[PDB]
Amino acid sequence: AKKALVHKANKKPKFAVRAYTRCNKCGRPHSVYRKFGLCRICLREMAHAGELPGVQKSSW
Amino acid sequence: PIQTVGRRKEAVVRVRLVPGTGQFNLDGRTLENYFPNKVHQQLIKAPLVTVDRVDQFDIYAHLDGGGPSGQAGALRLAIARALILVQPEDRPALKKAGFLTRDPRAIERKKYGLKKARKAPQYSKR
Amino acid sequence: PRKGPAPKRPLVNDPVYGSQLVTQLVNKVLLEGKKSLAERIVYGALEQAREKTGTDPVVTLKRALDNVKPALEVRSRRVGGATYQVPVEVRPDRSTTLALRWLVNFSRQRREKTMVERLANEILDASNGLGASVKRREDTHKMAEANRAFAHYRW
Amino acid sequence: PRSLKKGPFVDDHLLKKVDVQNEKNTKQVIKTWSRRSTIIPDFIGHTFAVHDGRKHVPVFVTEAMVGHKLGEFAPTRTFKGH
Amino acid sequence: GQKINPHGFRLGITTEWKSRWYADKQYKDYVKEDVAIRKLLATGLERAGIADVEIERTRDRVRVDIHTARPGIVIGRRGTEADRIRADLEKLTGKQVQLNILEVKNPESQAQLVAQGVAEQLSNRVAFRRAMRKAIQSAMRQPNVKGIRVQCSGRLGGAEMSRSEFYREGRVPLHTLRADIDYGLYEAKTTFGRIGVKVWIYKGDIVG
Amino acid sequence: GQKIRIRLKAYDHEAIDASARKIVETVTRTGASVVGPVPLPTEKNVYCVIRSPHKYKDSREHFEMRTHKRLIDILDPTPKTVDALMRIDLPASVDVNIQ
RNA sequence: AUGUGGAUUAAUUCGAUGCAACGCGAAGAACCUUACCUGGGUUUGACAUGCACAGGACGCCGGCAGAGAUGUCGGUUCCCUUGUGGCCUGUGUGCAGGUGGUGCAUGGCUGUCGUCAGCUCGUGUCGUGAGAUGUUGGGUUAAGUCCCGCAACGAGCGCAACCCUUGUCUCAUGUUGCCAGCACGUUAUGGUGGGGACUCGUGAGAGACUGCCGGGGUCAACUCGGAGGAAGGUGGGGAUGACGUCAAGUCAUCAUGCCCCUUAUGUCCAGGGCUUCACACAUGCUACAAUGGCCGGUACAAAGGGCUGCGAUGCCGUGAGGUGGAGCGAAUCCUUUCAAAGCCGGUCUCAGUUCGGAUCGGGGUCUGCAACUCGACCCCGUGAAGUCGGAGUCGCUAGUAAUCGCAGAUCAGCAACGCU
Ligand SMILES: [Mg+2]
Ligand SMILES: [Mg+2]
Ligand SMILES: [Mg+2]
Ligand SMILES: [Mg+2]
Ligand SMILES: [Mg+2]
Ligand SMILES: [Mg+2]
Ligand SMILES: [Mg+2]
Ligand SMILES: [Mg+2]
Ligand SMILES: [Mg+2]
Ligand SMILES: [Mg+2]
Ligand SMILES: [Mg+2]
Ligand SMILES: [Mg+2]
Ligand SMILES: [Mg+2]
Ligand SMILES: [Mg+2]
Ligand SMILES: [Mg+2]
Ligand SMILES: [Mg+2]
Ligand SMILES: [Mg+2]
Ligand SMILES: [Mg+2]
Ligand SMILES: [Mg+2]
Ligand SMILES: [Mg+2]
Ligand SMILES: [Mg+2]
Ligand SMILES: [Mg+2]
Ligand SMILES: [Mg+2]
Ligand SMILES: [Mg+2]
Ligand SMILES: [Mg+2]
Ligand SMILES: [Mg+2]
Ligand SMILES: [Mg+2]
Ligand SMILES: [Mg+2]
Ligand SMILES: [Mg+2]
Ligand SMILES: [Mg+2]
Ligand SMILES: [Mg+2]
Ligand SMILES: [Mg+2]
Ligand SMILES: [Mg+2]
Ligand SMILES: [Mg+2]
Ligand SMILES: [Mg+2]
Ligand SMILES: [Mg+2]
Ligand SMILES: [Mg+2]
Ligand SMILES: [Mg+2]
Ligand SMILES: [Mg+2]
Ligand SMILES: [Mg+2]
Ligand SMILES: [Zn+2]
């Protein structure tokens, strides 16, 4: 993600319609889950490292 | 007081036995009114038919969850178990007939990447 | 089937009459898995045949299956770069099952405008010996007795 | 189609330009950079130069095309066939 | 993909979360600040190996506990690095921030710091041969640890090719959930590019 | 008759059980009637993610977000009991809501 | 309806190209995302930092001109304290800045061979040497799982187990959940006082181990049958990819070595595009009519979502929806008493059809500053191809194949027939 674009997105837009996520660190505008605030690969890596208190693999 | 519970594919049922007449009370309505299916009535009457004590027990049923067939089978199991409880002397014939053996099959887990249950997406080598 | 003969399911019997042939027929004619629809249609057509013929539905069905059940079949085989057919005897159980299959197949593909009546009429025709099922059986027996020559292969 | 309650939408700058033009009675070709501007009866005798991305193409407006957007009459893609 | 990380695979049985706190409304802001501060600390401190970073949050108060190879440079005799870290956290607006230093017992009984050392030796001048030999010997010398496996991937020696070589000794039963595996991963720098080093350590078994 | 709904809501079974045990002991020592940690259905949140970017999406996996909630209806809310509940220090893994 | 090939366009941004890409990287392209094309500004710069010369301004809320950036003006102005810290307006200095290139340089992650059972090491012995034994033969198992003699003696990654769910029972347990047995309701149902006698939801323990018997077996593995039992010979489904191969995918996640731009290939905005088509391929729904279309009555489940969000009753609309707004951070209030198929009653007697609905016109609702290219929903007119299909080819062996539904991920509005 381009730093200039990230900074512009962080800035306050002149219209409310121009608000979008832009996953925080990697700046990926796509494949991001709202509550987490992180994209698919970010979630994968952080969960595998165990940095979030409560996510874990699935087997039911 | 005699109580019993039957479960099959998420079909929990309640039955209370009464030596009075052969009245069927399914949520306040008779068996013929509730689930009017000949296969149902047949399977529900199968245990009493096997034991040959017809028109001697009154049953009140409370049903929650499950489907029609599931509820019918659970009720059959419940009345069979209640009959055994009130008189275990029929154990060897009823177990040989298979009325006292529960049915240990239900909806199974289905895979991620598969449509449902055991389904498989179209698999073409092209 | 590599390990060996697989177990066979314990097919149930029909309580309405007392013959598992009715259960077999309804299972064969099952379309889109509508059991109640299939069984009600089968019972209605059986009653139609009964009122049309004036006889016992079970007896006439037994007559039809007896008349239409084959005893010899034909199997395909290719040897030495050439295709050939061989006749092989068939178990009566499989013969009855395939007879039911042909009954359904020829109860599917005729132009009587109403299949509920048409299946009954097809049953009457098969019982009387003018049916497409008996015609197919005639053709199958003719093929088998024509290819009798290649029976030496025995497979 | 735009809802009647909201009504037609006209850009403020182009509205000011056309108002000045029709008030001064001068009729000239105006460089139009707006594709979302709807047509108004006041545009009956005004010429607008719409931008298609390559060059401002003038268009003459009459009463016939009332109720249609400016970009409808300005092709955006060139298709010469095969 | 070849192998899933044993840490993630065995989270639910043996290893515990290294961060514990409850929130749902400000959960986004909280996770943002934690991941930020973690990245900033990682990029700020490189001289001294840091095994793990654990954060616990109780309402406004936040406590961070640090494990490092040696505290000499992690905390100064007068508190140089301590005061720099405090000032950093205050700039990040951690509200009430409390610092603690916890020292590991066995320096080379765990994956992270041995990985750091191997990366440093590979980067500076040391050959991967001697690097693996010394690392394996030092890890073995400790009685508690039983199995060690070290893998190095990337460009080795400046050759225009990728060499994937691994050396194994002792226990590596990743399929057995009961086993205890320690996982580490760090990247070694060099003039020609980047090299990744991965190490697995087995430490006994747990019943209960 | 007044009742206080002490809401226990955490992620880990061990943590929630320990917090419940501590609450029961505190209430028993202070001398108040508590029904106990009545089990409640556990909300299940399942999320699906792909293996890696740039296709290879046929194989997936799921992550759950375990949330265990317990009901604690305490009768006779003694001032001493409420004060003790305020002063009790619990781990960050457990958050208690008083309503 | 989506994705690609092939042709145009100034652009249709780039990558992936049989198995192992083609409802792909796009879990939501009108601005943004876009990096493509035209045009207008811009400069040590939209955004950080250290060195010298200029300083207390910077930072901000509004009027005017403009396609917009932006230019000019109206209102406030430092917190410390004499050294300056914070911040940045003009000159540069290094330098920022690049979705520009290089997955034939790489880190990490991922797909297939394949959930196949194979793959190794220590000592010894043999030959000179590249090497062989262990890993050979017989029996048995889903398995390098095991037994028997053999220059072999041992060990390792794998296989099974330990983890989740599902099949039963026992104990603990009663609210927002249920009612055995008692009272109040009297049409609204445990609704209300009461109660663990069972499910109900979440804690502990037991239960399958060839457990026992008969025959085959080298008296050994292993196998058939039989009794008890819920399960009989890994009960069922899962988490779980040994060394390696395909220079397999990913510098368009992120980081990373080298080359390239720096007054541009960086940067802000106005309109257009990624939805273009004389054709082709792949995946899905609708069907091609009676096992049915349509109309009226009518009974059966799961689980999850809900704060700047679900939305009750009531009123007006055919219906999109308009007013209103109880109950809710949620076993409580909404997602209808969660229904569809199912059962009963009536029409159609096989038609290019009362099946079937696309295309093209005339009227409205909803979210959005902005619905023509380019969204979705409601009403009407329109009535096209299509009668089981060519060689070829695909999935499926028990709750299995077929058929009919419900909720969620991205989301103000949807391309939602895709995915879970
Ligand atoms: Mg947006
Ligand atoms: Mg994103
Ligand atoms: Mg494919
Ligand atoms: Mg295993
Ligand atoms: Mg499609
Ligand atoms: Mg392309
Ligand atoms: Mg394809
Ligand atoms: Mg292709
Ligand atoms: Mg797909
Ligand atoms: Mg663009
Ligand atoms: Mg675009
Ligand atoms: Mg490139
Ligand atoms: Mg490439
Ligand atoms: Mg092979
Ligand atoms: Mg020698
Ligand atoms: Mg050999
Ligand atoms: Mg060999
Ligand atoms: Mg051997
Ligand atoms: Mg081998
Ligand atoms: Mg093995
Ligand atoms: Mg009760
Ligand atoms: Mg391999
Ligand atoms: Mg390669
Ligand atoms: Mg290559
Ligand atoms: Mg680069
Ligand atoms: Mg680089
Ligand atoms: Mg360059
Ligand atoms: Mg540039
Ligand atoms: Mg722009
Ligand atoms: Mg596109
Ligand atoms: Mg459909
Ligand atoms: Mg209305
Ligand atoms: Mg209803
Ligand atoms: Mg239509
Ligand atoms: Mg139509
Ligand atoms: Mg329709
Ligand atoms: Mg046609
Ligand atoms: Mg037709
Ligand atoms: Mg063919
Ligand atoms: Mg959306
Ligand atoms: Zn991300």
What DSSP line would sit under chain E, residue for residue? Answer: -----HHHHTTTTT---SEE---SSSHHHHHHHHHHHHHHHHHH--SS-EEEEEEEEETTEEEEEEEES-HHHHS-SS-HHHHHHHHHHHHHT-SEEEEEEEE-SSTTSSHHHHHHHHHHHHHHT--HHHHHHHHHHHHHHSSS--EEEEEEEE--TT-SS---EEEEES---SS-TTEEEEEEEEEEE-SS-EEEEEEEEEEEE---
List chain A residues with CB under 8 Å of E28.
35-37
Q: Residue written as tokens 């009130």?
A: B86
d(CA B90, CA E101): 73
Secondary structure (3-state) at B16: strand
Cα F43–chain centre separation:
12
Nearest nt by C1' to D17 Cα: G66
Nearest Cα neighbor of F8 from F80, F99, F84, F79 is F99
Secondary structure (3-state) at B76: helix
Question: Exposed (0-12), middle (13-18) or buried (19+): which is B100, by Cβ within 10 Å?
Answer: middle
Number of helices (H), then strands (E), in chain C: 6, 2
Nearest Cα neighbor of C120 from C66, C24, C75, C54 is C54
- For residue D24, say whether its CB is under 7 Å from any atom of strand G: no
Structure tokens given for C126: 């098969």
Nearest nt by C1' to F67 Cα: G202
Q: Which residues contact F68 (CB under 8 A, 6 or more apart)?
A: F9, F10, F11, F12, F13, F16, F42
Q: Which of residues 33-52 of F touch strand G (CB under 7 A)?
A: 35-36, 38-52
Angle formed at CA C72 by CA C67 and CA C77, multiple of 5 degrees: 145
Task: Walk across the sheet containing F46-50 and list its strands.
Answer: A55-57, F60-65, F46-50
CB atoms within 10 A of CB C135: 14
Whether E22 contacts chain F with CB within 8 A = yes
- C-alpha separations of C57 from C20, C64, C70, C101, F93 in Å: 14, 10, 22, 19, 74
d(CA E181, CA E202): 5
Task: Walk across the sheet containing E50-58 and list its strands.
Answer: E19-20, E50-58, E61-68, E96-103
Tell how far the Cα of C37 is from the centroid of ligand 34, in angstroms: 28
Q: Which residues contact C52 (CB under 8 A, 6 or more apart)?
A: C120, C121, C124
DSSP E strands in chain D: the ranges are: 29-32, 47-51, 56-60
Distance from CA of B38 to the nearest CA of C (A): 9
For residues C42 and C120, the answer to whether their CB atoms sit within 8 Å is no
- Of the partner residues A24, A50, A53, the one whose CB lies closest to the CB of residue E21: A53
List chain C residues with CB under 8 Å of B38.
15-16
3-state secondary structure chain F: CCEEEEEEEECCHHHHHHHHHHHHHHHHHHCCEECCCEECCCECCEEEEECCCCCCCCCEEEEEECEEEEEEEEECCCHHHHHHHHHCCCCCCEEEEEC
Cα F22–chain centre separation:
12
Provide the pairing of β-strand C82-89 with C72-79.
antiparallel
**Count of alpha carbons within 13 angstroms of residue A46, beta-carbon side:** 23
Experimental method: cryo-EM
Provide the pairing of β-strand D29-32 with D47-51.
parallel
List chain E residues with CB under 8 Å of A33.
none
Q: Residue written as tokens 């059980």?
A: F17
List chain F residues with CB under 8 Å of B113.
58-60
* Ligand nearest, relative to CA of residue E161: 23
What is the spatial distance, in angstroms and rounded to an integer, between the CA atom of E33 and the C1' atom of G162?
Answer: 39
- Core vs surface per residue E26-62: b (16+ CB within 10 A) or e: eebebbebbbebbeebeeebeebbbbebbbbbbeeeb
d(CA F96, CA F99): 10
Q: If you ran DSSP here, which 8-state letter would residue B90 be given?
A: G
Distance from CA of C17 to the nearest CA of B (A): 13
For residues E135 and E143, the answer to whether their CB atoms sit within 8 Å is no
- E7, A48: Cβ pair inside 8 Å? yes
Q: If you ran DSSP here, which 8-state letter would residue A34 be given?
A: T
Distance from CA of F52 to the nearest CA of B (A): 15
For residues F50 and F16, the answer to whether their CB atoms sit within 8 Å is no
CB atoms within 10 A of CB A21: 17
- E21, F92: Cβ pair inside 8 Å? yes
Size of interface B-F (CB pairs under 8 A): 7
- C-alpha separations of D50 from D53, D69, D78 in Å: 9, 11, 16
**Count of alpha carbons within 13 angstroms of residue E117, beta-carbon side:** 22
The residues pairing with E195 across neighbouring beta strands, listed in sequence order, are E154, E188
Nearest nt by C1' to B8 Cα: G167
Question: Exposed (0-12), middle (13-18) or buried (19+): which is A34, by Cβ within 10 Å?
Answer: exposed
What is the spatial distance, in angstroms and rounded to an integer, between the CA atom of E198 and the C1' atom of G120?
Answer: 21
- For residue B38, say whether its CB is under 7 Å from any atom of strand G: no
